[PDB]
């Protein structure tokens, strides 16, 4: 279905919750069919379409009794048990697959393979099944969440040219003076995951300076350039070679990394930093003047591969990670939407 919303937001979809949500339902009783869909995406991911389908066709097969002088009370006294009996049928009918000739991973495979069929990526299921099923595995903490396998979107390229990353990724390059002059490719790095802004206090706590004697002047300024020498050389004396931070890295901070052959990035996505540490094995520190080498991270290869004429930071190949990152292509910028919603529909079945 192709839906163009009231605000020109053009959307193509197969996702039942996504179709029913983009339709503004006003009728109070028909809004139930939007909730009924919504609960299904919330607990399962697939079925959203089928759930609404069933619901109405129960109401429609109750109308031939409602036309005759029957009480709706007794009709639902009959359905309430019918569903309680339908659940009894499935529980007896469900097959524990660990018992009978199944593969360790062809359980999630042949299961995503069903969720794919119907949606756009049907003719590409092969590719997406042996990737997003795989993506639930790297995700596995004892108990897991999809917040850790965050999807990134990049305009252009075939949807086949999508890329599985065993580390993390940034749909986000930034650029300062040195960022081009810096090395944008490592092998075995130590990833320092920082928090606080490396510069001359760009949004920090304001404090007024009163100075009576002139010579205090070059002193107060030479205190500043020394206050961040400590904060910066604090990074060099860590054993790090890749510096990421939730807050900004300045023009004058990037300089020291550029010459000292260290890679740095500022204004990192908040979700991405928590995506990095889980797949780099590091720890987000809010202060440089404390850091032990027990906080750093590693990977197989860090490079800034340019995909779709936007610069992506790809540090990947991390042995033991409780996180990964999908990186998705697709023809138009509306395809990339209906593959992301299509893939969330497979992952949650897996």
């Amino acid at each position: 279905i192709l839906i163009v919303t009231s605000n020109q937001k053009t959307t193509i979809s197969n996702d039942g919750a996504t179709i029913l949500k983009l339709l503004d339902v006003v009728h109070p009783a028909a809004k139930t069919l939007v909730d009924i869909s919504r609960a299904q995406d919330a607990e399962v991911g697939d079925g959203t379409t089928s759930v609404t389908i069933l619901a109405g066709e129960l109401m429609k097969e109750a109308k031939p009794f409602l036309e005759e002088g029957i009480s709706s009370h007794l009709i639902m006294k009959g359905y309430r048990k019918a569903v309680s009996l339908a659940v009894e049928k499935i529980n007896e009918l469900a097959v524990d697959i660990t018992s009978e000739k199944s593969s360790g991973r062809e359980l999630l495979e042949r299961c995503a393979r069903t969720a794919m069929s119907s949606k756009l990526i049907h003719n590409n299921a092969d590719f997406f099944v042996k990737m997003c099923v795989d993506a639930v595995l790297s995700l596995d903490r004892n108990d897991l969440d999809d917040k850790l396998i965050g999807i990134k979107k990049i305009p252009g390229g075939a949807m086949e040219e999508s890329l599985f990353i065993n580390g993390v990724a940034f749909k986000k390059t930034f650029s300062y003076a040195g960022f081009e002059q810096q090395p944008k490719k490592f092998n075995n790095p130590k990833i320092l995951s920082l928090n606080v802004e490396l510069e001359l206090k760009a949004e920090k706590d304001n404090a007024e300076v009163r100075v009576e004697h002139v010579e205090d002047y070059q002193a107060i300024v030479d205190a500043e350039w020394q206050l961040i020498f400590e904060k910066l050389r604090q990074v060099e004396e860590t054993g790090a070679n890749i510096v990421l931070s939730k807050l900004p890295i300045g023009d004058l901070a990037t300089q020291f990394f550029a010459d000292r052959n260290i890679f740095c990035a500022g204004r990192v996505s908040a979700d991405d930093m928590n995506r990095v540490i889980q797949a780099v094995g590091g720890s987000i520190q809010s202060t440089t003047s404390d850091i032990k080498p027990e906080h750093l991270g590693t990977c197989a290869l860090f490079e800034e591969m340019q995909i779709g004429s936007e610069r992506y930071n790809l540090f990947q190949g991390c042995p033991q990670a409780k996180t990964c990152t999908l990186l998705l292509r697709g023809g138009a910028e509306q395809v990339i939407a209906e593959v992301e919603r299509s893939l969330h529909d497979a992952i949650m079945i897996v």
Binding site: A39, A207, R210
Partner: protein
């Protein structure tokens, strides 16, 4: 409460103000980590420097609570909240059986199980669940009507 201006006179003050601010709050948290605490529930705000140190000290942190929660949480674990940060008393602490991130409906939710209790009425239509909360409350109060008289 009154505007906090920070008047730096000599250059010796800059290095020692910031590096001392490191310690100032690291010492605020240590006076609560050396009391054998494993969970600090915050009604108000939390500082990024302050969470950093509590992050290392191996302690869970739970922000957001408005007035409603601090009181109803207080009755379950059996703590007593203090506004003065300098008196973490062993006699005014709590005790909780399980504090985990049980994900329900896909939501990252914190639990405080095992006094004040809580029912999690699950369903489909967020519309009908709302009514059966009024059905539950009809009885919950009908129980309060039994006791008093």
């Amino acid at each position: 409460e009154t505007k906090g201006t920070v008047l730096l006179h000599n250059a010796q003050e800059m290095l020692d103000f910031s590096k001392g601010e490191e310690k100032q709050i690291d010492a605020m948290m240590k006076e609560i980590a050396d009391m054998g605490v494993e969970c600090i529930v915050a009604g108000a705000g939390v500082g990024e420097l302050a969470l950093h140190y509590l992050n290392r000290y191996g302690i869970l942190v739970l922000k957001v609570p408005s007035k409603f929660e601090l009181r109803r949480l207080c009755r379950v674990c059996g703590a007593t909240p203090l506004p003065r940060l300098g008196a973490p008393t062993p006699e005014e602490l709590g005790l909780v059986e399980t504090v985990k991130t049980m994900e329900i409906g896909g939501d990252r939710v914190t639990v405080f199980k095992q006094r004040t209790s809580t029912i999690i009425l699950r369903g489909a239509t967020q519309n009908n669940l709302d009514d059966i909360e009024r059905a539950i409350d009809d009885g919950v109060a009908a129980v309060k009507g039994l006791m008093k008289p």
